Amino acid sequence: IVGGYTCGANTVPYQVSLNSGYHFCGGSLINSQWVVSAAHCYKSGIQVRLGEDNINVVEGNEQFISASKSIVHPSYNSNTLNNDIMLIKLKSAASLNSRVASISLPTSCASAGTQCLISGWGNTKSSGTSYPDVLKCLKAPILSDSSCKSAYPGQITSNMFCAGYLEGGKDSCQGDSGGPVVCSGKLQGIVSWGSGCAQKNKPGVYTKVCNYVSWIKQTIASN
């Protein structure tokens, strides 16, 4: 996250960290056994680390549970960054407490102006690199669909949506992928792509979760 702030240990209970010997993506908990991240974050043998803050130090609230099945979206297209949604089922049900909780699926597709919280352990510099130990947070509003298409000519599809600041300086970044976008208690988006980070007229693009509520439930029932 660029231009954000330190969230606070376990202040974002649904934020999980996809680990592969080290942190590589974010994820979101939607129930004791299912984590929703992005498709491009798909790997083999992913280990889901719950209840984190400092991902490089053990503080006592963690919960590491290896992935038993990693289901990437069937229509996912890497060339178009389209349908960038993945479903991860844990092999062991997470223990739900105050530091490890599920975020509920969206019930609407939030309009422009809606206020959200984007979080993750990604890079904190638009120019240069600097990766945090603790989870960072960013309060950002969903931008107009038209502002989105103008900023990313011929790239925006109905399965995506921009959030952030057209002027720059505040945004999500590399290492935030598969991360959560919670607008008023509900999971509206997943940190997907963008051009650079916190650049002018180059907002972050997020997978529009509201379009997959059906897919997520066909999946969770038959698995």
Binding site: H40, N79, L81, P153, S177, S192, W193
Partner: protein, 175 residues
């Protein structure tokens, strides 16, 4: 654990700098630039003539906000230190007499013109090598069914171009 990996077998850092070396050095050295035709400066993307040079360090980026380039992602490729006369350090595929060629521009080019590359792993049992695909928008999808290759021009320069043969073999060395 995805497809794109460097010489040491590590995932490629998104936005990181790498030397684009060849598998078979009789083909040339790393990538760099040269001034061809009426170009006011080195705007032609070529494989170095020097069989020993590592070429220029090259930035490899994906719009995906991941730490490393996702398997099958499109990429923009640029010189970490391009020649002053170029607007941006990114490569682009312009139309040419002898076919679509990889060049630099003196004009800042919109993103559609630089988000046109994709790596394809070569099946060598041991040593990580990739070919390079050229991609262009079609029916609301971007297709990558054309390879990049080398066209030796009169003046010698080993030009990277969209040919159907002499495809590029690439080995990435972190810089």
């Amino acid at each position: 654990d995805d497809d794109l990996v460097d010489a040491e077998g590590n995932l490629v850092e998104n936005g990181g700098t790498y030397y684009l070396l060849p598998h078979i050095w009789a083909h040339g050295g790393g990538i760099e630039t040269a001034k061809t035709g009426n170009e006011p400066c080195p705007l032609t993307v070529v494989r170095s003539p020097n069989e020993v040079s590592k070429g220029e360090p090259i930035r490899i980026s994906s719009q995906f906000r991941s730490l490393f380039i996702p398997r099958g992602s499109l990429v923009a490729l640029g010189f970490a230190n391009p020649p002053s006369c170029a607007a941006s350090p990114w490569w682009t595929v312009v139309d040419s007499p002898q076919g679509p060629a990889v060049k630099l521009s003196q004009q800042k080019l919109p993103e559609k013109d630089i988000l046109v590359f994709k790596f394809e792993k070569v099946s060598h049992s041991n040593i990580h090598v990739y070919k390079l695909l050229y991609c262009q928008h079609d029916e609301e999808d971007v297709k990558c069914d054309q390879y990049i290759g080398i066209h030796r021009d009169r003046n010698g320069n080993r030009r990277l171009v969209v040919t159907e043969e002499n495809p590029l073999e690439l080995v990435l060395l972190k810089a």
